[PDB]
């Protein structure tokens, strides 16, 4: 039904449409791996959209930020840092937050700091450190869509409707 170009623009619509303070959306895509020796399903960054809401740390941060702008000032917050750092992460299927979602076709809704730090998932604990309080992973056939917010958000039926209209499902 859907495809990679349509991938990003739908993540946009989901974050904008919802009446909740969602900070970003990410789509983790499937890949296959071998070694010299089996076939492993891999989750990786297919795309993402950020909406939003120490001078050692900050000068370091703006410096990569200016380094990616030349490739193709302001202050850069924790949520923004977490969003772009996430582009380098990958998840073996059934491992971590996005992997566990995909193996069992599961939607994991983590609401509250305690739910994040008690989830046993690395990515959930890392998101909490950068101020996230809600993190969601909804397993699609196309992949896994991840939502995250600095606010505490309960699972809305209106949101699960929008997610279902913007991604592939078996």
């Amino acid at each position: 039904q859907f495809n990679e170009d349509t991938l990003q623009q739908r993540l946009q619509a989901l974050i904008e449409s919802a009446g909740e303070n969602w900070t970003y959306a990410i789509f983790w895509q499937i890949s296959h791996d071998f070694d010299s020796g089996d076939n492993t399903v891999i989750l990786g960054w297919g795309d993402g959209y950020y909406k939003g809401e120490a001078e050692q740390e900050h000068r370091k941060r703006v410096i990569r930020e200016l380094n990616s702008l030349i490739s193709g000032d302001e202050e850069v917050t924790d949520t923004e840092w977490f969003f772009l750092v996430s582009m380098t992460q990958s998840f073996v299927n059934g491992v971590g937050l996005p992997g566990e979602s995909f193996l069992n076709s599961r939607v994991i809704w983590l609401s509250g700091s305690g739910a994040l730090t008690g989830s046993g998932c690395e990515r959930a604990g890392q998101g909490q450190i950068y101020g996230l309080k809600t993190m969601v992973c909804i397993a699609t056939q196309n992949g896994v869509v991840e939502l995250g917010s600095s606010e505490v958000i309960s699972q809305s039926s209106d949101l699960m409707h929008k997610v279902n209209n913007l991604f592939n499902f078996n």
Binding site: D47, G48, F83, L84, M87
Partner: peptide, 20 residues
């Protein structure tokens, strides 16, 4: 604002971009 548009710039290409 400014940083947000750059994030979405890198995001839409980060699939092909291997070294971020």
């Amino acid at each position: 604002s400014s940083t947000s548009k750059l994030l979405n710039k890198v995001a839409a290409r980060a699939s092909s971009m291997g070294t971020i």
